[model samples]
Target: GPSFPEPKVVRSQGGLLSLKLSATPTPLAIAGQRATLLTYGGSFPGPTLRVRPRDTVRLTLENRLPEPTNLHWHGLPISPKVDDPFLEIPPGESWTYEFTVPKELAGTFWYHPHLHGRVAPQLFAGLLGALVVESSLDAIPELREAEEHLLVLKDLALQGGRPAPHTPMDWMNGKEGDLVLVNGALRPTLVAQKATLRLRLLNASNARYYRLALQDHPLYLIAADGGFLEEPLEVSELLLAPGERAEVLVRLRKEGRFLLQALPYDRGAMGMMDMGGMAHAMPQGPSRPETLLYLIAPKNPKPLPLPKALSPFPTLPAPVVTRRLVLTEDMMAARFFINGQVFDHRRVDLKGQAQTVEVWEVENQGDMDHPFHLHVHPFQVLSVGGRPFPYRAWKDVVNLKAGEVARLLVPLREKGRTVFHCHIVEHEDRGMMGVLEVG
Candidate 1:
């Protein structure tokens, strides 16, 4: 296998683009083993969709699977109709998502199956990909001269070369696979030079959380889920929960092989539960730090300058309304709850006025952390558990630790219906989601 194999990149042309995305079961080589993955266009992690602001994208998804499924353009600030999660394309049928990329929206985004109750397994089977909204960030002198790569991080549990079915225990704790993948390759090697490396990473896993760090190299944080930060902040590690995306800049200081590892992280715990007198041991493979990529750069690498300023930080207006949402889970019943109720598609769980800002206090009452994601509009994190955030940035997903409260300033700019939910695909399928209506 080649080092750092690039995924298929589809670019928009002439302000308009049309693509045929097919979801089908394709047998591909994963870590030297043949595995059948439900891929988009027969490629694991699908293709990287590159588009600029104001470009019109007409993507038709042909569902070749055995069950009904649909795609969600996660983190794109588009119309609710275009990013609709409820529109399921039946087997053999096709659906076209037509939308103009928001003029002001540009960053790292992704696409994945959003069918309720089936999202976990579908995405686990490999229905995901990266979407990049190109902007001025690409024009930055330092970034323009750097090598950019899209790393779609995912994991899988396999049984005799096939994806294992989710057990009851999987439903309770959310499925964290035994095999971790970067761009659908196991511990892929990336050949680098003595220059800046801009890694656009997307945590596309179902439930795994990655505390990413590079050996001997400090990572510069340039962007969060929705867009870039005001300046590059150096950090030793970055934690990305499922459904979250980050763009980090790393300067290849010296030669030799540098490893990108997911350091050990305790995301809280759910006590062991004996189901039917059979004790299932908790999966600990992901908790240990594991190498994700081998970056082998040549010698004599010169230092690269990092950008001092990247983007603007606009202050959010005071919220005229406030809402509280609680997250909980019932393992015995294999269900998750938001605001004391399971997901009901026909019901509107929250309401807001368009153009008004509101404060959403999302409290995690469960034992484990859950990444919360809101579609259509990105929010600014005010605080977590009453402590103000260390930095300012627009984010579409925030991981809420156990017993923690996250306060977000959500601006209702799009007038329509949308949903927010726990980003762990399994928990989302188990009912930790709610619908919102903006009038």
Candidate 2:
């Protein structure tokens, strides 16, 4: 697949702006036949939206399709009633979103249509895009140039020359695809200038967790979901769930044929006893559970070294409140639930105040894996199955294996109610979602 042209960034004032949402179909050849596929702005993974903190983003969703739709700013701080509203834009109708960005965070976020029962099919048809929230000040000199790259990772399941239709089983388990894309292009080649390259990776899949690692070099983890970490953490493997983002620095040191690959993490009972017999049953197909990206180094690389440290992150203080959330799987329905209750978009579950710390205990009791995503803020993993995890990286999404219990320390610093749901679009639509409010 060919990559789309680089998007131009437009800055908005502190109040309101208009976002037009329309759908169209483009011809894509798959399995030797040309089929028309639906898309937003006539492209998959839509366009890049760049903004700063304290900006009011007013998006007017113009529904040009015959079906109803709504947009969800995956990780933005906005009221659930406003951000994830189940609005039905009748064909030619439109819905406007007016929300202010909080003044506390910066990093890569994203947006996509969130209509229940059809989200997976819509997303797979290309109704998603990247939303980069840049810091107010230019702190990193090496990453201030045009060499920075915004890669929105996604998977496509095309059959019979079009996006495959979702089945009931797809909603029960998580539906993923065999094709991998970066910025909507497959096997994308980047001509690095040899400077310190800033890669803003966003996992926009319906239900896939990627274990990202460089082909041969070590990448510095400068920031996680919310923003910059306390210091740079060099790791060989970084796990990213759907709707999660990671900002990393990679020095192209004579990159001959360096590849960025996302391998699937095994979350089954066969590996560890702590998994409690809930492991992902291998998909019943010949699909290789890995995706890759190619990076072609420039002959004359720029003169830039990886920074030892980037920004500072404050440690989470004592939690003001704690909540226990149990994730279970219904064998009959093949659907996931929270605390035995499926998702009900009309119901709001948790509420809190801004600038407070809360602890959440998520226990998984299903057979399939679930990647729990909390909108608006990043959280720290305190422990897994009662055992502490040494690395407390801030994350907006975390995956739990079957029969596993994970604890997180979430600091609510941004105002407005946001959603916390399974990144698996089908599961989310089937009722594995909840809402959180912060004032």
Candidate 3:
């Protein structure tokens, strides 16, 4: 097996980071197989960009792919003008995205193509990277002393040395690849000392749900999609939907091998309904258990205590207003929608005032799970099915199960037109999205 090509880390200098990223078709080796795929900067994952709070990033995106494309800074709290999906660059052209990292934002975020109707193909081909926002909480003795690993989980399906084309079923149920990759390598091994390990995990798959668990180690979760939780949570299994990010800590107790596994989970069926609304169940989607990584820990490691507390969460004020949105799909037409309408770039579906707190009641009337993602500002999960959540965490993306209703506390701090949609990129591309104008 080939070694993992850990993405090259690029850092900002003198409060600014300037880089040129080109999207092109390049020949790369995947687990000893040669394939031609679209990549940013000629790599599966373009590069790992590290920046501090309040730093300015001026990035030039050059599109050399045969089609027009754009990029989105997933989970970043930047302005819509800076992170606009409507901004597209044609082939052989370039665009520069300039924005300042929010002073209070720190977490594991990602970047990928955002072009409508073409996101699934482009992203599946490979144009994504991890973006890390540095935090002072990392300076804590327990956290800083542990070894850290940035892992991006993705899958691919290839045919004749190239990405396979999508089918009608793929559009209905978002495509899940047959081959899984961790940091662009199959079954990559992480060699570390017998110490605590900090794993920053991103579920970058287009539609795969990762029921992640270690064979013997209990994962200590410290952060959600937006930022760190108040304290570490011990769990046997963590299920991450598409577009979600999680940071966990695992202690290497003995000097042996460990396996990170993805367990089987039933996320509901993508079935078609009859005239009377009785769904004719289709064959089960991808739910096989998979081993995502292998870890080898040698001896000579000291004990490191886990942090009792990481960061404090703020108390959100009561929302003055509440709105309801439904997630639905027309199976015959194979089009998804929010409020029964497809995405319209020129239409303003919702409106709000800047600096105001609002509550959004999102209900999934569809047959399958939909991961909801809102841009610019992270929302708090107030409750689900009228029962409040046990713990509080900031999140840019949250999963809504079939027939599940969730209330989100959204603080509209920026004034611009942004969109919220199902993180299943296919659904988003088809039409399960809406535009929000806050001012």
How many residue pairs collide in each prediction? Answer: 0, 4, 0
What TM-score does model 2 achieve against the real structure?
0.86
Report the number of backbone clashes for model 3.
Answer: 0
Model 1 pairs whose backbones collide: none
Question: Candidate 3: lDDT of 268?
Answer: 59
- TM-score of model number 1: 0.96
Please, what are the lDDT tens digits per residue for candidate 3 over residues 249-344?
Answer: 987777788899888977754655465766574647549898998887769555588899988888877777898999998754669989889999
Please state every model's RMSD to the true fold in angstroms: 2.1, 4.7, 2.6
lDDT value for candidate 2? Answer: 0.72
Q: How do the candidates rank by TM-score, highest first? A: 1, 3, 2
Which window of ten consecutive residues has the lowest lDDT sum in model 2? 266-275
lDDT of 3 at 316: 77
Error of 3 at 387 (Å): 4.5
State the lDDT of candidate 2 residue by residue for 1-439, as single tens digits: 2232343444565544446656666775432446666766666667677777777787776777678888888777556667654665677787887787777768888888887767878887777877877784346655575267777778777877788877665666566776776766666677676556788888888876678887877887777776776666678878777777888888766748777887656533111123567554443422345646777777866646555555565666789998989887764465668887877766778988888899999888876667888876678877876788655456777778777788999888667656788777778888888877788
Candidate 1: list runs displaced more than 4 Å.
269-286
- What are the runs in model 3 whose C-alpha is more than 4 Å off? 1-4, 269-281, 300-303, 385-387
